Amino acid sequence: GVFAKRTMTKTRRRLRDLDQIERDLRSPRHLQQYKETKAAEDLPGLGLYYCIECAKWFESETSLVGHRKGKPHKRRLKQLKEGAYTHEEAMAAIGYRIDNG
Amino acid sequence: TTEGLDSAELFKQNLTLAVNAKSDNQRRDALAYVTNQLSANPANNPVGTVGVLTKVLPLITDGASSVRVQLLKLFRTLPPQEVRPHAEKILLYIRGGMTHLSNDVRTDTLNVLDWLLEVAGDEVVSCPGGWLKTLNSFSSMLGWNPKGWTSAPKGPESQAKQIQVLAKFLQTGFRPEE
């Protein structure tokens, strides 16, 4: 289930995008900025247990491994396998290109 | 804090609280402390054996069984050569304690009498009233005493202790002399 479905679409309840997660997977700098955004003392397990694919912090290794066998994790893996939707894909869909000379 | 006072004043104060305190636990603690100091050093007795006995002999008929047991421990701690000259007053206190109504204090008084016999037998059996009055008390609290109505005769562990103390008293009185 989803906690508080009445306000799931509010801006203050927004979750991380797939393109951001893909950039975190490719580059550790972008993930480093996302982690320096949060104060590590207020994270489960002091932020030592993190799933990049789900962009989630977990309390323990047992919790992380239990997450890794679940269908939300496999959905995130399949979405990353298909690829996130980006601006370049939007321009490719509309047949528009950048001319840098 | 009671730390500036010396050991003699501690001894006298704890003896006074052991005699006059209204708390059973406080009397037990005071008696245990004075017994501990008398066990550690017999020389640590500012008031002396006579004063100690004079203060703690009324405590035989106390209702507190733990206080009675600690009083017996004090009596066993107390030096026998100093116990020996004062056998008569102690024997008055054992006679009162045996004549007391409560069976528990009767048994503990028999224990005190056993201590008195094993410490100073000859003074008990030779002092004025130490023989016949003690025999009268024994007969009275065993019910062995010698207008048209007849009277029924007057637990087990108490009677066994009574007969054992009587047997030891008779053995002490008729012990073979060399």
Partner: protein
């Protein structure tokens, strides 16, 4: 004194008050939504203990 805190709360090794409250929160289960320790509630517990005398403390008398 530090050993009084260690005996009272059965915890040791903190470097400051923030880490002490965080360790006490994680031990006692004072956790908010998202696994965040409740440092405010734990500090309130420790203050209540301090004024109610569950934590031993005194002011020493001046020397003569």
């Amino acid at each position: 004194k530090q050993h009084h805190m260690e005996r009272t709360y059965e915890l040791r090794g903190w470097k400051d008050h923030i880490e002490f409250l965080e360790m006490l929160a994680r031990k006692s289960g004072r956790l908010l939504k998202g696994g965040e320790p409740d440092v405010d509630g734990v500090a309130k517990q420790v203050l209540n203990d301090f004024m109610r005398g569950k934590i031993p403390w005194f002011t020493p008398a001046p020397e003569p």
